[model samples]
Target chain A: GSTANKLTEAQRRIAELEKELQRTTQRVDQLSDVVQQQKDELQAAKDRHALEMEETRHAYNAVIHRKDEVQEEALRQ
Target chain B: GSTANKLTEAQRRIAELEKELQRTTQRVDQLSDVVQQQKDELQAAKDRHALEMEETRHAYNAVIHRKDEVQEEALRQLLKSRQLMVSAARYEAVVAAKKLHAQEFELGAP
Candidate 1:
């Protein structure tokens, strides 16, 4: 009976560790979710920025072309 | 000696909680370090990307920023310069937010 009493206290410590382990595991999972969600958002933002930059490139190229045409016309006249 | 027995049991429980509290605090510290490390890495990546982006921008502008040059090559170069900095910033923010959670756990535990 004396040994059983000691074993029970030790058992309680194991149980406590198990509980804390579960809590830690849960926290890790939650953080993982947060990271993944942010990754998705980042990808979406990248795609949007890519499109905007593409538009800016086209507009800037057109301006360059227009300027060249105006200079060529002046030269011809 | 019944009172003595009660005092010893309470003391043991207090010691157990204190130990648990210390472990949780340590975990919090570990998590905070990971978050900070990631943030620093992200910042470094961002700084490098910014420099590259500026260099690309300058090259593109010089190549086609005038009426004298009708360089078709500038378009391809500008398009290729789409190095996204959003990922680094996003991850840094997310991981940094996790540090707050770690603190909350530390405060609420034990």
Candidate 2:
């Protein structure tokens, strides 16, 4: 009967430890989610800026072509 | 106390439930990320179009101004000079507009 008493007590302790482990794991996961959110926001900003720069380049090229055409005509004449 | 022992058992069960909840939440978060990725891509595409459209408009206006200047000078210049200027401007505008339109098509195509 004494061994049975000890065995039950051990089981009870084990259960409590498992519960604490689970709670800690969940907390860690939640924190990881917060980190991911921040990363995503930064990446979104970067992508947006890159696209804008590309279009600006196109515009500059277009204007340069126009200027060149005008200069070429003056020379040809 | 027996009640304290039972309380511990209840806490243990609660913890297990909490872990299950976490796992479930993680799955949801993963799915949410997929949705967010698609949304971001769509917004990025729209932003690209808006930027390009604005650039195209400005370029058109600038070139139009240049064309008007060429027309004004045409009256005083000889045929060779006038035609050369008109030809040069036409060629450049055509090339620029071609590339711009091509790029627009590339982005807009399904």
Candidate 3:
């Protein structure tokens, strides 16, 4: 029936809620990092694929030219 | 003592705190969705990259095979040409030697 006792109880509950809020904020921050990491990894993989594709294309062209060189060499003789 | 009035004030504050907690929970749930979406997108990108890499590897191998085939063809052609030249040279040398022998016979006879 005392106002002091009831007020004390209310303060304790508010403190608990505040602590939960802090924990939730931290988790959200951690999630942000997780999301960003995934994005970066995906981009890197795509870049690697692009480079490989370019290199393969260049090699194919070189091979095609090599075929022509062989024909010319035979004719020269 | 106006204990009822003070108690009512405390109750109102508690209710406000409960509302705040609900909102926070909702925000956390939204963040979970955000994180999951990013993971799904990343997996998709990686899968695409894997397919591309496979294609590139196949092309690279094919190109290498073609280069080898071309080189082999060139070498075969070169060998054929060299063989031709060698045959021609041998024919000419034999013909020249035979002609010199015929002349020597004529000189000795005269």
Candidate 4:
């Protein structure tokens, strides 16, 4: 019968699906890399923010402490 | 010729690929959302840091200015006392300056 001819046509569609599958797999890998990169960058930024906040806190305390100490010394002198 | 069996097998594989492709596309979309969310979080953190830094600068200037003014006032008072209590003027000025600082004052004595 001519049904075998229809089989070949459907087989060609199988090839198309396989090709698209390969493309999708490639894009998934690319997206995975981007996701990982974004996560790392965000973590780094948060770490820096934490350290900077601590530094500012220390600075604030130091400034006030010196201010009070200097005034006290001035009065004594 | 077993050609029918092979044909059915190929169609099955085709459907499998199609289904997997849909899943992969969905995964890609999810990853995109995650990336965008991370970017937004980073931007927000940076904004907060910038504002905090600006506030710190203003606070530093205010503290330093107040320190200078307070010291100058203490000095003026000490000099005035020097003319009166020449012997123990320095010691007396310290006691008076302590009173001028409300932060160090007695709870009810202020």
Per-candidate TM-score against the hidden true structure: 0.45, 0.37, 0.64, 0.74
Q: lDDT: which candidate is best? A: 4
Off by over 4 Å in 1: A1-3, A41-52, A75-77, B1-37, B64-110
Q: Name the candidate, 1 or 3, with the larger DockQ value.
A: 3
| Alpha-carbon deviation at B62 in model 4, angstroms | 1.7
B1-110 per-residue lDDT for model 1 (tens digits): 65556556655775776577667656656665666665566566556655655666676677665535443344445445534456667788999899989999899988
Candidate 3 docking DockQ = 0.39
Model 3 local distance difference test score = 0.80
Q: lDDT tens digits, residues B1-110, model 3?
A: 56667777877877887887788778778878978887788788778878877887787778778777876787888789989999999999999999999999999983
Per-residue C-alpha lDDT of model 4 across residues A9-75, encoded as one tens digit per residue: 8799988988888888898889889888888887887788778778877887898898788777876
Give the per-residue lDDT digits (tens) of candidate 2, residues A1-77: 45447547756766766666667666657756755775676576667766766766777678768776876786577
Q: Candidate 4, B57: how far from true, in Å?
A: 2.8
Native contact fraction of candidate 4?
Answer: 0.64
RMSD of 3: 4.6
Error of 1 at A9 (Å): 1.8
Model 4 residue B42 lDDT?
Answer: 80
Kindly list the per-residue Cα lDDT of model 4 for residues B1-110, writing each as its tens digit: 57787778887888888899899889888888887887788899788878887887788778778877877887888788777776577778887888778555666583
Looking at model 3, the pairs that clash are none
